């Protein structure tokens, strides 16, 4: 396939960029980000246009393009 | 100021 570059913005305004294929499940991006922050993956929620990114979402499914932004927040009360 | 960080994610 071919790759797009996504920018992941943290609560402290820091950024890590990820190159990902249009068909790759975004679980792998979440794991890498959490690993690099040194926190459990389940302590974080990952949002695209404010909507929750699921483990089996792909960039194609979400309509993501080159240089789109993902925001990371702490997980919230409830489901 | 932080340097640029780009990580390549592989498929399955």
From Swiss-Prot, chain A:
Sequence segments annotated as region ((Microbial infection) Interaction with Tula hantavirus): 1-7, 19-22
Q: What does this protein do?
A: Ubiquitin-like protein that can be covalently attached to proteins as a monomer or a lysine-linked polymer. Covalent attachment via an isopeptide bond to its substrates requires prior activation by the E1 complex SAE1-SAE2 and linkage to the E2 enzyme UBE2I, and can be promoted by E3 ligases such as PIAS1-4, RANBP2 or CBX4. This post-translational modification on lysine residues of proteins plays a crucial role in a number of cellular processes such as nuclear transport, DNA replication and repair, mitosis and signal transduction.
Locate residues linked as Glycyl lysine isopeptide (Lys-Gly) (interchain with G-Cter in SUMO2).
5, 19, 21, 27-28
Subunit annotation: Covalently attached to KCNB1; UBE2I increases cross-linking with KCNB1 and PIAS1 decreases cross-links with KCNB1. Interacts with SAE2, RANBP2, PIAS1 and PIAS2. Interacts with PRKN. Covalently attached to a number of proteins such as IKFZ1, PML, RANGAP1, HIPK2, SP100, p53, p73-alpha, MDM2, JUN, DNMT3B and TDG. Also interacts with HIF1A, HIPK2, HIPK3, CHD3, EXOSC9, RAD51 and RAD52. Interacts with USP25 (via ts SIM domain); the interaction weakly sumoylates USP25. Interacts with SIMC1, CASP8AP2, RNF111 and SOBP (via SIM domains). Interacts with BHLHE40/DEC1. Interacts with RWDD3. (Microbial infection) Interacts with Epstein-barr virus BGLF4.
- Give the record's disease field: Non-syndromic orofacial cleft 10: A birth defect consisting of cleft lips with or without cleft palate. Cleft lips are associated with cleft palate in two-third of cases. A cleft lip can occur on one or both sides and range in severity from a simple notch in the upper lip to a complete opening in the lip extending into the floor of the nostril and involving the upper gum.
Q: What is the lineage of its organism?
A: Eukaryota, Metazoa, Chordata, Craniata, Vertebrata
Q: Quote the protein name from its UniProt record.
A: Small ubiquitin-related modifier 1
Query: GO:BP terms for this protein?
Result: cellular response to cadmium ion; cellular response to heat; DNA repair; negative regulation of action potential; negative regulation of delayed rectifier potassium channel activity; negative regulation of DNA binding; negative regulation of DNA-binding transcription factor activity; negative regulation of DNA-templated transcription
Sites where Phosphoserine occurs are at 14
Species assigned in the record:
Homo sapiens
Q: A single GO CC term, please? A: nuclear stress granule
Q: Where is this cross-link: Glycyl lysine isopeptide (Lys-Gly) (interchain with G-Cter in SUMO1)?
A: 7
Protein's UniProt keywords contain 4Fe-4S: no
Curated annotation (Swiss-Prot), chain B:
Give each disulfide bond as a residue pair. Answer: none
User: Where is this chain's protein located in or outside the cell?
Assistant: Nucleus; Nucleus, Nucleoplasm; Cytoplasm; Nucleus, PML body
Induction entry: By interferons alpha, beta and gamma. Up-regulated by IRF3 and p53/TP53.
Return the annotated site residues (Breakpoint for translocation to form PML-RARA oncogene in type B APL): 2-3
Annotated region (Sumo interaction motif (SIM)) at 6-12
Q: PTM details?
A: Ubiquitinated; mediated by RNF4, RNF111, UHRF1, UBE3A/E6AP, BCR(KLHL20) E3 ubiquitin ligase complex E3 ligase complex, SIAH1 or SIAH2 and leading to subsequent proteasomal degradation.
Physiological role: Functions via its association with PML-nuclear bodies (PML-NBs) in a wide range of important cellular processes, including tumor suppression, transcriptional regulation, apoptosis, senescence, DNA damage response, and viral defense mechanisms. Acts as the scaffold of PML-NBs allowing other proteins to shuttle in and out, a process which is regulated by SUMO-mediated modifications and interactions. Inhibits EIF4E-mediated mRNA nuclear export by reducing EIF4E affinity for the 5' 7-methylguanosine (m7G) cap of target mRNAs.
UniProt note: domains: The coiled-coil domain mediates a strong homo/multidimerization activity essential for core assembly of PML-NBs. Interacts with PKM via its coiled-coil domain. The B box-type zinc binding domain and the coiled-coil domain mediate its interaction with PIAS1.
Pathological association: A chromosomal aberration involving PML may be a cause of acute promyelocytic leukemia (APL). Translocation t(15;17)(q21;q21) with RARA. The PML breakpoints (type A and type B) lie on either side of an alternatively spliced exon.
Question: What is the annotated quaternary arrangement, including any partners?
Answer: Key component of PML bodies. PML bodies are formed by the interaction of PML homodimers (via SUMO-binding motif) with sumoylated PML, leading to the assembly of higher oligomers. Several types of PML bodies have been observed. PML bodies can form hollow spheres that can sequester target proteins inside. Interacts (via SUMO-binding motif) with sumoylated proteins. Interacts (via C-terminus) with p53/TP53. Recruits p53/TP53 and CHEK2 into PML bodies, which promotes p53/TP53 phosphorylation at 'Ser-20' and prevents its proteasomal degradation.
State the name under which the record lists this protein.
Protein PML
Q: Which organism is it from?
A: Homo sapiens (Human)
Question: Gene encoding this chain?
Answer: PML
Q: State start and end of the fragment within the whole protein.
A: 551 to 562 of 882
């Amino acid at each position: 396939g071919e790759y797009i570059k996504l920018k992941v913005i943290g609560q402290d305004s820091s950024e890590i960029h990820f190159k990902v294929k249009m068909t790759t499940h975004l679980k792998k991006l979440k794991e890498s980000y959490a690993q690099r922050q040194g926190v459990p993956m389940n302590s974080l929620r990952f949002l695209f246009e404010g909507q929750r990114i699921a483990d089996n979402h792909t960039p194609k499914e979400l309509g993501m393009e080159e240089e789109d932004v993902i925001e990371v927040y702490q997980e919230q009360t409830g489901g | 100021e932080a340097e640029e960080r780009v990580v390549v994610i592989s498929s399955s």
